[PDB]
DNA sequence: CGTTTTTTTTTTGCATGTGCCGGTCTCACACGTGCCTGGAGACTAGTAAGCGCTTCTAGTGGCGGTTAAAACGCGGTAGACAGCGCGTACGTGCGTTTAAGCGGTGCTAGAGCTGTCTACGACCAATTGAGCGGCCTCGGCACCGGGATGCTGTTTTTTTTTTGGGTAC
DNA sequence: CCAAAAAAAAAACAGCATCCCGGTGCCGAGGCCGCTCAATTGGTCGTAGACAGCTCTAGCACCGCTTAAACGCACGTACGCGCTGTCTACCGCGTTTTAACCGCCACTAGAAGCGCTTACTAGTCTCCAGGCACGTGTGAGACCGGCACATGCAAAAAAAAAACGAGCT
């Protein structure tokens, strides 16, 4: 129902620093299925780690250990 | 009575936003898409800004990541426009789905 | 060092997280170790490929 | 005389091939080739003969890896045709290609 | 000391017959020529890569003689893990 | 289990390296488990293209 | 041969972005205090590993022969690739629409630190059988030859679509 | 209707290779044995983490205003896409060449196992400033704003390589 929020417009950004040109209107479809995969993976994990402390509030330092789980490090969040 | 040429623009918005360093995604619909998901494995879930934020991050990031090697699939092809096939082709290749 | 000159490039006395995210993707050898890391407020090179600019 | 179509022969190859698990490298030249390339970091060593099998199973499998990868980047440019551009792109997109 | 052998470029000893046998495998049905000369300038980077990492583990455990666990430390650590040589 | 189907359909009583891979890379779960790692003397599964059959 | 062309250079006018001169403002870098805990120090204690000696695994190298794989050339099929034309899916842009963002305030769930207590794991000693190294047998699986049968490619069997002169309507 | 014809197809025959068979052979699976060491039992001692309590940070809610952004539609351009003609690279098959691989040989580097010696780091307890949380200041950078100038863009004309005849042999 929210999947939308990520806007056609917001897309074209990101592909136009992605280095794109010409975009078919197919793609922003397809963009969010994957944002979603990509966030599900991330934020699933990244609960884990919040269920695990036994918190209800997940923490910056919950999702920087999911991503670093799956290959993602972030610099610039706890670390 | 002045216009510009299918696709001399995109190449200026292209050149501003490599540039630039801003969160390209509008930072509430975001919020909202990451609580919403979180709710279907814990319900009754806070979140700290900074954790929002690292999610924006890490998803701006990697799909700024993914529209590069699309981009490159669709050069690939004889084509600029990129498609569909192409994202298909480059997580494939990435070994994210199968 | 590296972003301590891109500072100086772009007249900046304090150095941003773009200054170490241009240092880092133009030493091939810092980029290779940081290879799966992912710097924020970062954003790309500056890069348009042959086939998308004018004849 | 008999004379099959090109890509006929070619195709039981690759069922012939796909089917079974052995080496397909000639394991001397191999030897030689680790022999020859592990001097380059320091001469005269001695190597276990599962050592040389080890390295021999971890490349022969990369490269049939590489060549899915590879014949999917060829299909995607619409050709059957594997070709240096394939291999190129595949690496680029994995990463082991700056 | 020094004895028998000194280098040699063995590099052609990947017959044309070889690559054509992975790539059938690897489900290719036609193969460009600069394909052969191609596949040896990765083949050789990817051996390089591996063996010196596997000479590295050798230099710590001050062998002379590369194991096929030196090997499979390496492989793992350029994250290709290997099962059916220890570990 | 999977290992043994596959040694079972192949008409063996021995499970060898071959019927590993066979089972780890036809269950969708232990393949994505075993993602970054090879199989020695596995091969690979018999996946031709279909745009690479006959017209 | 000197006519229609495209169409390839040439001003031509035009619009953004990049400043480099201004100028004002705000909050985050920057630095200063005060105290508290984490590194400094000196002494003790125990064993990890560095060293020298031995065992004997296993890694090397060379032979000689068999014949499987590497090589090379010819020929033509078929696939790459360019060219060209037809269609609309995209981009550009200005006009209308929304709701994000900002700065603010109100409320308290829950994050997080503190002092207490006791359950559980390390630690330490003796036992003792689980699981190892070694040894030995026989049946699964490699090997081979022979035959059935699926499967490819080349002829023939026939059966359509681009086209083709008669026929009434 | 009864032609094409060419294209497109169907199957009929003929041929090649792979699959699955029993007939054969050996070596590696599988097991049994006997022994060493690593898992267990029992007991002790020290503290990790659980629990209750409290503090108070920061996450959630809402609100009203000011645009920045999303949406929406329109018009046509440039790019996706098919179809077609061409041209030679590659696959297929065969004759020619090569040395991989086989089973064995003898040689010995050095991998790995032992025992001792000792110098090195854990472990303690005492002491204290390095580096933390806290709090204050002020100049960098945000942010304009406009002129000016250099970059690149979209046009609208002007020279320069096709199509178009007539028109001799």
């Given at each position: 129902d929210n999947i939308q929020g990520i806007t056609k417009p917001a897309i074209r950004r990101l592909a136009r620093r992605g280095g794109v040109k010409r975009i078919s209107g197919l793609i922003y479809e397809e963009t969010r299925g994957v944002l979603?995969?990509?966030?599900?993976?991330?934020?699933?994990?990244?609960?884990?780690?919040?269920?695990h402390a036994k918190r209800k509030t997940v923490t910056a330092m919950d999702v920087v250990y999911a991503l670093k789980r799956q290959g993602r490090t972030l610099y610039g969040f706890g670390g | 009575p002045h216009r510009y040429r299918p696709g001399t623009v995109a190449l200026r918005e292209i050149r501003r936003y490599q540039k630039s360093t801003e969160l390209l995604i509008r930072k509430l619909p975001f919020?909202?898409?990451?609580?919403?998901?979180?709710?279907?494995?814990?319900?009754?879930?806070?979140?700290?800004?900074?954790?929002?934020?690292?999610?924006?991050?890490?998803?701006?990031?990697?799909?700024?990541?993914?529209?590069?090697?699309?981009?490159?699939?669709?050069?690939?092809?004889?084509?600029?426009?990129?498609?569909?096939?192409?994202?298909?082709?480059?997580?494939?290749?990435?070994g994210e789905r199968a | 060092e590296l972003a301590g000159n891109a500072a100086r490039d772009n007249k900046k006395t304090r150095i941003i997280p773009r200054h170490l995210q241009l240092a880092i993707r133009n030493d091939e050898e810092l980029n290779k170790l940081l290879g799966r890391v992912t710097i924020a407020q970062g954003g790309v090179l500056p890069n348009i490929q042959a086939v998308l600019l004018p004849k």
């Open positions: 979603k995969v990509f966030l599900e993976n991330v934020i699933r994990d990244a609960v884990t780690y919040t269920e | 919020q909202r898409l990451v609580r919403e998901i979180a709710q279907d494995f814990k319900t009754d879930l806070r979140f700290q800004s900074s954790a929002v934020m690292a999610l924006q991050e890490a998803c701006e990031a990697y799909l700024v990541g993914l529209f590069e090697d699309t981009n490159l699939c669709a050069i690939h092809a004889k084509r600029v426009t990129i498609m569909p096939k192409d994202i298909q082709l480059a997580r494939r290749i990435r | -």
